[PDB]
Each structure stands twice: as C-alpha cells, then as structure tokens.
Design a protein around this ligand. Structure first.
Ligand SMILES: [Ca+2]
Lengths: 172, 223
C-alpha cells in the first residue's frame, strides 16, 4: 500500500516531508557536523520535542505518483543554510560502509558510498502511520540510532538491534 | 509528462487512468475488457476511469469501471524492475467509441529513431511538482540500446527500451507510470522508470511491450 503522511494522506513521490519520530521526546531529522567535520554532514535526529528538523524530498525512480512501501527510495534534504565552507555540498542521504558505529547515514560527497536504495515499511500496531526506513545495498538492514559517545549526537545508522520508527508531515 | 504539450480533446482515445482515491498511474485499453499497464502500479482495489481529458471535471463522456482481474506478469521483479507489465480486466466491457478506442498491439519491435507519442497526467516540472488537469502529450524517439545501456549501466534488460532525449527537457515523470508510448499506431512501450525527469543523460526507461504480445494474447484468451 501507499505510505501515508500523518494526515492520513499518501506521500507524493517527490514531495517534501518532515521526518518526525513517534516518541515526542525527540524531534526531526537534520544534518549536523559530527566528529571531525567542518560541514554538517551527519544525518542526525534532534532531541528537542519542538524541532521538526529539516525537510526531506522522498522519491522513487519508479514513476508512480505516490510512495508505496517496498519501492526503492532516494532521500534528499531540501536546501538548508550552511557556512561558506559548505554552500554547495550535495544533499542526498547516503551510507558510508565501514565506520566505527557501523554504516553511517551521511550527506555530502563520501568516498566509501555504498550502492543501494532506501525503502519504507509500516510497523505501527494499526494506530498512527508509523514506518521505518531500511537500506538494501545492490538482505536489507534497518535504520536505527547510534548515540555519539564522545558528544551525544543521535547519529542515523543501519542497526539490526534497533530500527527508527518515523512519521512524515507534508511541508508545503 | 515534462516539456510536452496539452493533448487535444480525445486525441488519444485508448489512454486510461488507474484511480484509487486519485490518479496514481495510467494505462491503455487494448480490447473492450482488458487494460495493459506497469506492474509496479499493482494495487488491491483499482478503478479504471476512461474517456477522461481533464481528470478533475466530469465532462460526461467518461466511464468509471472497477478492475476485476489484475494479473501482473509472472516473472516481474520488483527489485530489478524487469517485466514491469500487468493486465487489468474491466469488470464490464467498455463502450468503444470516439472518446474511447483501443490501441493496437505491436506487430514487431520499434526501431531506433522511430518517433513516438507519450501521454499521461503525471508531473510537469523537472524540479517541484505541478499536476495538470488536462492530459499531456510528448513526442520522443525510441533510443538505441547501445545508447540506453550507457546511461543506465547494468540496469537495462532485454525488455526495456529508452525513449527520450539525452539532453533532458522532454521526458515522463511521477504519475505517468503504466501509460502508453504509442509508435506508428502500435503500442511500443509502457512508462516504467527513470532517475528524476528530463535530467541530462538519463532518458526514461520503458517496458518493451513487443516482448509481450504472446503473453498478453495468451492471458486474455485464458482469462
Ligand atoms: Ca474528465
């Protein structure tokens, strides 16, 4: 079936949605600098119950009009303000294979860019429109959270142990 | 469709619309009761609208009919996108007339450079999204395999053709899948995929119907 935004409406293939989390404790997805990066290159998760993070432009090579779960997806942050040292960095979500905390989700140009597609999958015990992203390199692996130890940042990563239940909200 | 132009009224009579809450794909009527389209458009409940021009207004020439059978090709691969083709059986044969005709199945495969007509109510903007009321038309030639493969290395199967411009500008998009690519009064392609739309060095990838005449013709005869 088609993936529903929080307003029970399906996600438009190529639209822009906020990727909120189920637990109100945290917030939305956004790029932030981490470890040794002068540019905000780590797709992170806010901890503020009020920051809806950055807008993502979900999309599939498949020309259908809405996003159906099980279809290959390509996630991309909408243009967001950065420093002069970063204006021009690519915005597409990627997965750099082999990093301490496991395959991390990073934006910008990254050498060890693993080939594959994202895919959404419903989880919710038939209540809200709760989904989870998975990565299937070209079987699949969920996308959970690996807390930055020496910092605290909720870095996005593929973790079997735990996935990341998220819910979208149209931008406009 | 992006870069095309608004089709005239009932210019393409055989074109349909897969509706399930709202337009999400298209198709093409081949005989009074069946509808061929992209297999990735499969959905449990489908309403095949016909005789449509402006899909937002009831012009009183359309026929809304539910699908009864929706058979996706046996060897269709959701992963590799190969064999993106399905047949939909109208639960009541349409009334073939002026505003509702049927496109002919291909007698042979389309040669490179053969010009074609693509239509759909899919997105009109390269960046952003503008969904039309009226059906859109596009004139694009069927690119050579030697060329197609180059643009999508490792992804082109024996069943996919490329049709468009390596220069960008005119292409199909979200909301056109399942639709026709009609060449010389013969159905020679079904919208299936691409990377973005009208992007440079990325033409659209279309299912090669000509590799399905025997399947189609058997399935309909069998069901
Ligand atoms: Ca109409």
């Amino acid at each position: 079936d088609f993936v529903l935004d929080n307003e029970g409406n399906p996600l438009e293939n190529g639209g822009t949605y906020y990727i909120l989390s189920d637990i109100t404790a945290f917030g939305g997805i956004r790029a932030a600098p981490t470890g040794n990066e002068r540019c905000p290159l780590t797709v992170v998760q806010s901890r503020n119950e009020l920051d809806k993070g950055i807008g993502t432009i979900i999309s599939s090579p498949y020309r259908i009009r809405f996003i159906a779960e099980g279809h290959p997806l390509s996630l991309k942050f909408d243009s967001f303000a950065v420093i002069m040292l970063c204006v021009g960095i690519p915005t597409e979500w990627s997965v750099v294979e082999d990093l301490p905390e496991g395959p991390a989700v990073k934006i910008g140009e990254n050498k060890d860019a693993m080939d594959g597609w994202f895919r959404l999958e419903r989880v919710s015990d038939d209540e809200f429109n709760n989904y989870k992203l998975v990565f299937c390199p070209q079987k699949c692996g969920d996308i959970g959270i690996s807390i930055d130890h020496d910092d605290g940042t909720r870095r996005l990563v593929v973790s079997k142990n735990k996935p990341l239940v998220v819910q979208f909200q149209k931008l406009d | 469709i992006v870069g095309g132009y608004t089709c005239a009224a009932n210019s393409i009579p055989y074109q349909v619309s897969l509706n399930s809450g709202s337009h999400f794909c298209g198709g093409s009527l081949i005989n009074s009761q069946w509808v061929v389209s992209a297999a990735h458009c499969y959905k449990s409940r489908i309403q095949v609208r016909l005789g449509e021009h402006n899909i937002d207004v009831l012009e009183g020439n359309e026929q809304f009919i539910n699908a009864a059978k929706i058979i996706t090709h046996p060897n269709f691969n959701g992963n590799t996108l190969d064999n993106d083709i399905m047949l939909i059986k109208l639960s009541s044969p349409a009334t073939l007339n002026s505003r509702v005709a049927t496109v002919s199945l291909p007698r042979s495969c389309a040669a490179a450079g053969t010009e074609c007509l693509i239509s759909g109510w899919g997105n009109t903007k390269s960046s952003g999204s503008s969904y039309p009321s009226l059906l859109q038309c596009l004139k694009a030639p069927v690119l050579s395999d030697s060329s197609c493969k180059s643009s999508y290395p490792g992804q082109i199967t024996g069943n996919m053709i490329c049709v468009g411009f390596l220069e960008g500008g005119k292409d199909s998009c979200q909301g056109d899948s399942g639709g026709p690519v009609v060449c010389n009064g013969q159905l020679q392609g079904i919208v299936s995929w691409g990377y973005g739309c009208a992007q440079k060095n990325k033409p659209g990838v279309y299912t090669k119907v000509c590799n399905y005449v025997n399947w189609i013709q058997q399935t309909i005869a069998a069901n």
